Write a protein that binds this ligand. Sequence first.
Ligand code: ATP
Ligand code: MG
Ligand code: ZN
Lengths: 300, 194, 189, 222, 174, 414
Amino acid sequence: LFLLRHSSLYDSFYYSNYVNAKLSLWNENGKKRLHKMFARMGIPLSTAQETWLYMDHSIKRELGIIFDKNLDRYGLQDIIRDGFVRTLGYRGSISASEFVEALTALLEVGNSAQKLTNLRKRWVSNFWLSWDALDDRKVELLNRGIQLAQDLQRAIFNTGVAILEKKLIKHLRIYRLCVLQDGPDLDLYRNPLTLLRLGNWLIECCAESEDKQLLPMVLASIDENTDTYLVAGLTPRYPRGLDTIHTKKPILNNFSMAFQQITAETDAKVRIDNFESSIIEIRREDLSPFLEKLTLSGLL
Amino acid sequence: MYGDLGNKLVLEAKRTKQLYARSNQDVNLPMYHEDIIRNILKEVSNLRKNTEYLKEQQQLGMLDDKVAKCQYFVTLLCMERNKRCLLAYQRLRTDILDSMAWNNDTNNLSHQEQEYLKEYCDLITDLKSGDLVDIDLSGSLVPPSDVFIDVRVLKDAGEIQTEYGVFNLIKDSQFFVRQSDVERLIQQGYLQKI
Amino acid sequence: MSLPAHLQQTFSPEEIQFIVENEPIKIFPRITTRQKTRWQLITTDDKALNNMVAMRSTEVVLWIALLLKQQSKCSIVAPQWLTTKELDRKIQYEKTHPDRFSELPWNWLVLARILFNKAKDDFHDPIHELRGKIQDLREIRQIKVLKGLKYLNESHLQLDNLSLLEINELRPFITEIMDKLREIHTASL
Amino acid sequence: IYVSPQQDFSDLMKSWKNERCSPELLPYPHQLMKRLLNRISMQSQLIENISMGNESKLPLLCMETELERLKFVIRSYIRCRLSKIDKFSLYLRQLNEDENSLISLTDLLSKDEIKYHDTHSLIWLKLVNDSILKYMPEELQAINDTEGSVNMIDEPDWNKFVFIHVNGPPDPLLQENEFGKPCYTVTIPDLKEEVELTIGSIYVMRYEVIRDLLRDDKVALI
Amino acid sequence: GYYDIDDVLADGTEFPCKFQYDIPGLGYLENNPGRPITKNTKLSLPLWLARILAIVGPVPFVELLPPDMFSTKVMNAIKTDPVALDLHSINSHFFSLAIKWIMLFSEKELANVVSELLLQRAQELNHHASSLSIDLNANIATSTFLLKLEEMEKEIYKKSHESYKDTKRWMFKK
Amino acid sequence: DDNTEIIKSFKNFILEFRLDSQFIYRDQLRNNILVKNYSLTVNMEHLIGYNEDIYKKLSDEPSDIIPLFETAITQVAKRISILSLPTFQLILNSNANQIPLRDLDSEHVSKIVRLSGIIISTSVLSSRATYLSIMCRNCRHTTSITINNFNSVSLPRSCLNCGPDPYIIIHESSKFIDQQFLKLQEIPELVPVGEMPRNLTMTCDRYLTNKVIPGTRVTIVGIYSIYNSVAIRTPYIKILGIQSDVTEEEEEEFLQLSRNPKLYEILTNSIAPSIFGNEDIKKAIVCLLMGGSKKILPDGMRLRGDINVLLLGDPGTAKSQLLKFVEKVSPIAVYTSGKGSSAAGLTASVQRDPMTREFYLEGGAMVLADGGVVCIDEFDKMRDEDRVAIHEAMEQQTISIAKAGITTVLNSRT
Ligand SMILES: Nc1ncnc2c1ncn2[C@@H]1O[C@H](COP(=O)(O)OP(=O)(O)OP(=O)(O)O)[C@@H](O)[C@H]1O
Ligand SMILES: [Mg+2]
Ligand SMILES: [Zn+2]
């Protein structure tokens, strides 16, 4: 769940990759199913939306039993897991996943060639902003990171809802394409980490579950301020929490070699400089030709 | 009467002192108040003219001893008050200038004050070059502490070659160095103790 | 001027810490300096440092003890006064007499903070108990100081066994008020 | 009288504290500062020699930290002395010129301090003459007048209050009091009062009454 | 001292005076040039002139009438309740002027009142200076009393507050 | 038994809590005691962190638990301040989910809730009782009863012969505390379409009085209780904490802003950024916003310092938009339509208090605009009598309506 100990239970079940993938909350029927689940579990709706700290302590104590009793029915039996929790005296607890999410949020949204340099240097500064937060004397940075993580998750959820509702994910025998060209949150999708967050969100929902074949997904986002696409080549994933022989074998990501070959053949000023080869930057006028070349490559 | 301009100048000096006290190093002296000083000096010249007239009248004319004494004493007292006010203003400005010189635009300084600043910097260089050469007099009065600290650069710069070594001050790059080596760089504002 | 404004006619807490660290303390060395290079400090004795054996208690300056603890090469010996039992005894002594001050060491506030920060696992008593007892002692001392400030005059004042930090706290106010009263009295004569 | 380096450092600390808390400019301990500067120079040379050549890392670190601490103490003492000279500039000149008083700047300051005093006095006199004094009549151009409405020479405050700790001898002035304890006796002339200072205690006394004791080192300012 | 802004300003206040001589040419002192000053005439003069005129004369040139800030009303107000009295309105340099007055006239009755007032006000001054703030999440009386502080009291309060704040910051620094 | 245990728990919480190195609440209590401020502000987050059972008990039955918290605070204060004081007051800060004002219902009776709204009216300080001395009419038996504001007291009916209600209060040996009544209106945004704003009465005591004025957005933490006025009860709120949306750093920022060499031009630009042209009107409105320095003469003739402006042009000129922006920008402003209101709306009108039936004076727009700016629109449609009333009001800035049973006057510096 997403920031269970720093938000409301309803929000924890709402802004979650696995929960949404299992229940497909992006449509109204998913929200109705979630409401029915909460009603069956016995937790009221007003109580479920109260912050974790101020929520009634009885339900907080009995939560594990409630989850065990009433989650098999809705298929969310893989939600339960064992994780590390670190708490300092008289201060609220925090789990490893929440700490990592806060650190990533601080890295992402915390705070011609000139714009590129400014963006990269802002990311470098955010690196140090995150570095300090990793200490026990800088709890304020941790709280700010948690708030920023909440905001980023809300924005990514909204964008994913829009994409899924409008059915922008075209399907091809080899790969799947999702190109963004408008929206209110397109500014955020310039940091590779945020774009990868959106990619993971989309991969979990209907690309790894819902009886769908596993194909690499190419996700791109425009930025009119520089006229280029932050194309990212993501790898598929097997259903979460399903141990099997095929699950043991890692799913290799073949985007790097095909990307390099296509860049070598053509000339579109592709910026292959990120350490992760999955991400490049292609000019606006040369996106569709590059996609056609990738389709013809047959190397994915 | 005669001390109004002096009192106004003293009020301005008080305001300057309060401003200097409020901040630490951003303090910049206000524009050297020249008009009021010139008015006060015109007042002093007028008082000198009156004194000369009184002397002439006493030597040539009718002027009883008591009246002459009263007038002379009053004039002398006004001149003394003006002298005190101007001297206090100048002394305060000199104190601020000395503070600035020891710690380390000029349009706010009278040419005499600019010469004063130059000479005082020369003097500071003079004392430090004598027998007190082992101790850097123009140092930091914060007592020593943990020998090794982490300093983060706050301003992009080149491979500045200081006496202690070559530090590539790439913006947003942390160092782990002895506090002594990066004391002056911290003072100049390139680094941050965090 | 040559000296800042706040450093005139008084001290700063950093300088008080500097003064406090110039005192000796006992430590448990973890290495064997004694022979079967070597220290030649000039301000402090260097014989003790050159002759130290592991686990055998020795005396060195507090500043050097902290430097050794930074590398984890010694274990500081908490003074006898810091222990809990002594703190309860001193609290009872303070409570019994509402006029006189206890007889704690002059450096009982700086040393407490330095040891609580740098050496948090060398004590033989719980840390929170020590912090609470020190807070109670400080509060009672503050009450007594407040009560005693009503007897300022133009002749003199006596504050037996008052720590250096509290004297530094009160130096400006007491000195200035007494100076003004003395000036008024002198003018009266 | 040389005893040991640690004794010299203790004397340096005592002088620094006295100067910081004192209301007047105390005499300069020439020999102590000469010895300390020579020792600092020789120790720095020895440190350089040792560093020219991981068990020895910590000894050298302690060397450097100790040198930094000693340098800080000396620098603070010198700066305090310079500021005190700055404030009481005209008074020092009057004292030096005055033949009756046995005090002499050569017996109260070092060579660097006397150079600073002379140069600062000259510069300030030039500035005031250029700005203000040259326009005044012959009766009001003296920068040091002692017959006007307000004295132009600011003298040290002879009754400033200071915190004193009665250390005692390292003495006819010592008379054991009624409560089984040795104690000094002082007299306040303005109030016609007699005060008794018992060893191992902290007082808030006037400077003039205890100045002789401070000179003799019986008591030390906090 | 000579170079002290607060000392210079205090001497600039206006004290009542009564000329008991008949001097000509001193017209500008009263309100107009070129008019002889009659005798037994009251006028307001700055202290730096009134003091010298009173001291220097057999018969002083001026006779300082009882000021308005040392009247029986102010003495009774000071004796009644020192803390709530607003000294700032009475005079921004009350203590310096008071000390100068006692020195000039060596009156042993005002000294006791001034000393008691200063002590009582200093009690509350220290009470307010030692009360700092805490940012637990991460003054009205203080402001009300702070506005009633003389210049000397304001300086003492600022110094004491700075000392207390520095000590607290050092003590609770992480 | 249980009460003593709860008191000890609260005492231990206060005396033991510490985040990094500083005892927050101990030092806060000491500082508050030093300046004669008898109160303690506690963040509920810290209380939950220290021990969840204490917060559980506090939230369960606040009316019963809070007084014990005050007793513990008073005991700790006496321990900390007096070497071996009135009952202190507890102020609470919380970050729980806000409950809309319109959604309050019987489910939240006698529970701590957090809401928000806009204050529309405030009363004058009352005098509640905290320690009453009582003497019997017949046998003259002296007794004392202590009272706490929270309800889940009345004079004894049986003497401790003497008939019913035999006790009378000795007012020369009793103690009282301040009380105030406020009215809270739901935020305009949350009002559903076609419905009307609902109001809620609130009560505050001791150091929470005189903390707000009408027209200020506030956030309230308090107890939703009911007081008897078929078998219905009137809801109301007992305030425990006020946090209204209303130093040196801002002084430095403002001083730096004033140092800009084109301050006049930027200020004239900020005046109505959305309206083109009319630069002279923009500068005049800036001058009106800043105003003129006050003048007072010892004789009695004090000149006016405020500035008034007249905009007289044909329709479609954005005069109303300028007036709206002036109203919004100024810290204190009243936007009034001349025809919409009347003589009562502006200046002042003499009315009668219904509850007490006494003639009183109620101020108009100008009175409510004292110390600010009043933007009157459609000067033409306003009636001539109201125009002459405004003439007098601006002439003297003191609406002189002192007759008809009363002789009170009000200031209208606007
Ligand atoms: N320069 C301008 N920029 C923008 N709007 C303007 C401008 N000049 C006039 N307006 C118009 O002003 C309108 C709002 O002001 P309005 O016309 O009601 O003022 P008014 O002339 O006092 O009205 P009326 O005279 O009809 O009572 C807007 O609809 C608008 O577009
Ligand atoms: Mg209109
Ligand atoms: Zn009865």
